[PDB]
Design an enzyme around this catalytic site. Structure first.
Site, PDB file in Angstrom:
ATOM      1  N   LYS B 166     -19.285-124.681 -32.260  1.00 30.65           N
ATOM      2  CA  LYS B 166     -20.066-125.802 -32.692  1.00 30.65           C
ATOM      3  C   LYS B 166     -19.274-127.102 -33.278  1.00 30.65           C
ATOM      4  O   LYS B 166     -18.228-126.754 -34.018  1.00 30.65           O
ATOM      5  CB  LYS B 166     -21.183-125.826 -33.586  1.00 30.65           C
ATOM      6  CG  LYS B 166     -22.457-125.020 -32.835  1.00 30.65           C
ATOM      7  CD  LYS B 166     -23.797-125.695 -33.114  1.00 30.65           C
ATOM      8  CE  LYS B 166     -24.755-125.512 -32.471  1.00 30.65           C
ATOM      9  NZ  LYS B 166     -24.695-125.649 -30.569  1.00 30.65           N
ATOM     10  N   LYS B 266     -33.538-125.998 -20.728  1.00 31.52           N
ATOM     11  CA  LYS B 266     -34.088-125.621 -21.828  1.00 31.52           C
ATOM     12  C   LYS B 266     -35.558-126.024 -21.617  1.00 31.52           C
ATOM     13  O   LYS B 266     -35.875-127.290 -21.366  1.00 31.52           O
ATOM     14  CB  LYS B 266     -33.665-126.503 -23.220  1.00 31.52           C
ATOM     15  CG  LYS B 266     -32.310-126.283 -23.837  1.00 31.52           C
ATOM     16  CD  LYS B 266     -32.427-126.680 -25.269  1.00 31.52           C
ATOM     17  CE  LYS B 266     -31.041-126.802 -25.746  1.00 31.52           C
ATOM     18  NZ  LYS B 266     -29.909-125.782 -25.414  1.00 31.52           N
TER      19      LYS B 266
HETATM   20 MG   LIG Z   1     -26.236-126.759 -25.896  1.00 32.18          MG
END
Ligand SMILES: [Mg+2]
Ligand SMILES: [Mg+2]
Ligand SMILES: [Mg+2]
Ligand SMILES: [Mg+2]
Lengths: 360, 369, 369, 369
Positions: B166, B266
């Site tokens: 991240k 997603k």
């Molecule tokens: Mg992502």
């Protein structure tokens, strides 16, 4: 130095004058100096654009706790704050934005049009809908509108291309050479049928308005149709405005405040299209005095030479959202010249607020 | 014939396992707000569905918009046939435009019911089991430095071979953590650096240039597709597009531009399993690698993901993930299982998950008859 | 669990009901050659599928090619699970590239078996009943003005409002054919001038120019897409693309150019019900009006067409066709029905058709496990 | 004046000389199935042609497809003048669309007959001997450092200067293969890494980036053209396109994009010597380097290849190949020769090969006037 101290959301029913009811959402914002701002979003049909009446609640339940304590006079700071809280959902941010502009206008002692650059149009031209009746009765009714100052007329179409061809062919020889007609399909036709319509009416001067849902379907219709095309519900922001200009893909862009995400974005999209010499319509989806006040200031700050029309949204309902607002004189829409939006909430009509957030 | 007899909406809190989940340009979640839709029918078949965001400003989606939609839609959905998923799709799309995130839990519940009525797992109705155990990735969130060297050895022994770094909060230190994580990887392994829309375009370019000699996946460096394409002018690293993959229209643009090496799918960002399936099938027919995923959530959201991943061709499935394991609390009873770094869907009829009514509590909304 | 235990191939002649059928540039069909695939399983479920060309040179497809594919692939398909349609599709595409028409009868048998296994008609598995009764057209017709008026009034009374004008053999007399027919149609009626790839590009332009004052659908005036686009530069009429619509690739470029007003989808031309569905869905999400059909055939080909039609949104479905009613002989028992000029799918499990073993005769090939 | 009086189809097994032949993403050919067409005339001139796939799933072509085409087209070719190769080309294309691989053996046999009727080798009829001995490549090797050095030294001494590395099954160890092979060859030599449609686009890019400092030819990294162009966004290596080069339309696309440095031309992939010549001449006029070859096969396929190579301008002919030497069995008597690493066409009339009737066995199909 200013702070938001209270936010209230109001909900009220707005019935149509000719019969059926739209659901209004009013946001009322109080400050520590006692300056009160209001804003409104009202859809015309829940399926009409990427916008619905319950989405204001949803946005408020997330955003209003975060909006307490902030300075409403800074409209772009409030804009970026709201856009950092949730992405998109511009229709729902729109009543807040208008209320912030109302406050900035009160704090500055100026009407909203002055803060939008000035009065570039003294009385926005207006249109009249319909008439959908007999030949001698439409002739009498268009003469009543004509005598009263109207030169533009909206043929409501889009539910059946075949009878829509008939409606257009019947109305146009009943109006004078100085007069405009927009056949608004409201995203209604399938691409093949819109083309059949355009080919059948190719010998006619009228404005072809949002024949199909998507921009791309509309451009496919445009491949065949020579009629000046007006894009409306697909004009959703600056991105789309950029693509329309790059394609030179319309002769008029209709600018609805809440579809553009509020007066801040709506003004920027307008300014962009004016600088590209694209004629525009300044309006919103639906609503009463508070939504209409935003519309009239929006139209008054649009150059007269590029403003096609605006609309008196408040005169389509039998009930009210606000006290005051814009006025109509001789077929033209006039903004207020008093500070802010020139409209306060009609608390008698609005009822008890459905939600209330306040600083301790 | 089947009719929808009852619709209920539940809301619950799903706290994060490690405490804070740092993503993007300074964002963090401690608790995610789940929305669960429960659909009952006249033959006593019950479906369920879930949307849960990882951050309320992550995509064009927030948790309160599910309630708003249901208040509009649920009255009109009563008495309809829930197993006709594409009739339900176009009805929901006729009721309101957009707001796909909010339709996503209803759509899942419909697929669940259809599976029960056919006696088949949702992967069967999506085409069959084209991947037996979707390979998984382990996301190391925004934290310290010397502690990720143990995080890798933990997940390496756990079966995982794919890891997400991240990044996105500061391009300059981000360069340093890409550069220090990569030599800790082994030969048969992958690393994606996800900025979560975080970098400004000029800084994403600086990063791409300072890490040009490295093999990793550059994931969603900027907010818009155009910004990411501007980064791609300079960046040679395989690019993964994620939050900007909003549907088929964007998918068409990406394919037309050949504009990414991985497309992340997603379910709720695509607007439900129905639209997710169709965008998946489109990208695969165009030989674009995919990740099968959703934003966040408990067992109900993870059940949908697992069946989504299981019906994706394994040649083109990069990874998927165990979302239910990121939380301390539950939305459902059942859902997928994991074994040696791969995600396995249920083989029982429907989504293989029932609502955890004890966790969810009393419904916030209830429409019936 | 399910295993394919037997694959059989059948071949039969389907003679045309009105002697000789003229399509395109002078081409004539009096007998079409059907290929029928019959698939047995270990739990006693039998599936069936059919490909029958109109002409052998009509598309990239011929009747003998089904045999050739089955000779390669049918040994490899034994033991597999026919319910998993996307697994079977991927497997067939792995064994050979292209030859979609030849894979098409197998694919229809697999959908049939899935239907039966789930207790649902194939339309349910394709998303639901999105069109209850597909509109139909009449093929008509070629006589005097009074005899044309009479036959069109009977079709009008039968429920028909769409008419196909067979053209393409001679641009010059085709102009007259079109000019004769249109004033005999009523307002609202559709007329399609289907040249079936027959005109040379300059001659198609001449026809378009001489008929520019007319409301009809200009259908596949030339062989290639590029040619049709060159006609489209001059022709304002709605354009229907048919035989050049071979798959998703072509679908995508039709969409990018906004290259037609209607896309005609022949199941076998698209490579089976699985690929046809996906191209349908893509075109509908891009708001392109479609026709759901196939090249030719009996009840088995027609059953697939009807389910394909029934799961197409009524809003965008232009028409379908009753292929079984063009022949004097049968490939199947059962199939779709015709009511008031509309084509209705079956509501019983599977395709709703079983092989007409007496008409089909002995299998030309037989592979057992 | 001349007439086709008889057409015969033969089928034979061509086992691979070195057991198993590993190509692409997990494929292996042990025995290849040859299709030989023999055409007889009323003047006693006989012509032969061949198509043999290198794997049934290699291109849009399989062995059983020649049989199927023949059964439909051969009765329609009896009585026709085989010397008129363009008339025969256009008749075939009128009888069926596409399926050019199946037409290819017939086309070769007609060029054979024409060469015999004119008393000239096929290379003369294709423009002349523009290359005297086509350069060849060796598909070597696939092993240890000590064994690769000894094998490249024997190949060098035998005249070979170009080497193909068969890759495409594992991008990671394909990096290592390329890296270990390139410094083991001297200044003049060349090497092509043929992935044979095998890499996924993200993996092809990882391979390209890892080897971005190396001089080799990146051959057909992915299946589709567009996937290959996506790799080419990153890869500066000379790109060689092969299986996707299906005809002139694709060659026009390639030229327009300038999307390859070398185009590989397989006669049967182009639909026969006639279309193959036209595609090559078009590319040579557009100054594109070409490889002149075919899929696989014996002396009959190799005769056509050698004549195709011999009529290719030597400035632009990269290499050709000795297809007949890859097998342990024969389809023909005669064919081309190899001397000092160069492939030489015959100078006698026609293709320079007759059918090895003894190896071929009984005709599988026989059409007579
Ligand atoms: Mg992502
Ligand atoms: Mg409008
Ligand atoms: Mg047609
Ligand atoms: Mg090659």
């Amino acid at each position: 130095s200013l702070r938001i101290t209270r936010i209230r959301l109001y909900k009220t029913d707005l019935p149509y004058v000719d019969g059926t009811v739209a659901r209004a959402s009013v946001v009322v914002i109080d400050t520590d100096a006692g300056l009160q701002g209001c804003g409104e979003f009202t859809p015309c049909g829940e399926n009409y654009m990427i916008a619905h009446s319950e989405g204001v609640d949803a946005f408020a339940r997330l955003a209003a706790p975060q909006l307490l304590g902030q300075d409403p006079r800074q409209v772009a700071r409030m804009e970026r704050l709201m856009d950092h809280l949730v992405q998109g959902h511009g229709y729902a941010k729109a009543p807040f934005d208008a209320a912030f502009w109302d406050i900035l206008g009160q704090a500055t002692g100026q009407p909203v049009w002055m803060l939008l650059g000035g009065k570039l149009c003294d009385g926005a031209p207006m249109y009249r809908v319909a008439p959908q009746r007999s030949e001698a009765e439409t002739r009498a009714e268009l003469a009543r509108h004509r005598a009263a100052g109207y030169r533009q007329f909206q043929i409501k179409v889009g539910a059946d291309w075949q009878s829509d061809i008939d409606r257009i062919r019947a109305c146009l020889p009943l109006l004078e050479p100085g007069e405009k007609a927009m056949a608004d399909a409201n995203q209604g036709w399938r691409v093949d049928n819109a083309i059949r319509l355009a080919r059948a009416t190719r010998d006619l001067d009228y404005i072809l308005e949002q024949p199909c849902r998507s921009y791309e379907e509309c451009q496919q219709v445009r491949r065949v149709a020579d009629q000046p095309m007006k894009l409306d519900e697909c004009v959703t922001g600056l991105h789309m405005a950029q693509r329309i200009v790059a394609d030179r893909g319309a002769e008029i862009c209709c600018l609805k405040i809440s579809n553009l995400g509020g007066l801040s974005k709506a003004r920027r999209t307008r300014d962009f299209l004016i600088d590209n010499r694209m004629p525009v319509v300044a309006e919103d989806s639906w609503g009463g005095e508070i939504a209409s006040a935003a519309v009239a200031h929006f139209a008054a700050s649009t150059p007269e030479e590029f403003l096609i029309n605006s609309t008196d949204l408040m005169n389509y309902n039998t009930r009210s959202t606000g006290l005051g607002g814009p006025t109509v004189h001789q077929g033209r829409l006039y903004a207020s010249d008093t500070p802010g939006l020139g409209v306060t909430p009609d608390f008698n009509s609005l009822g008890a607020p459905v939600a209330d957030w306040a600083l301790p």
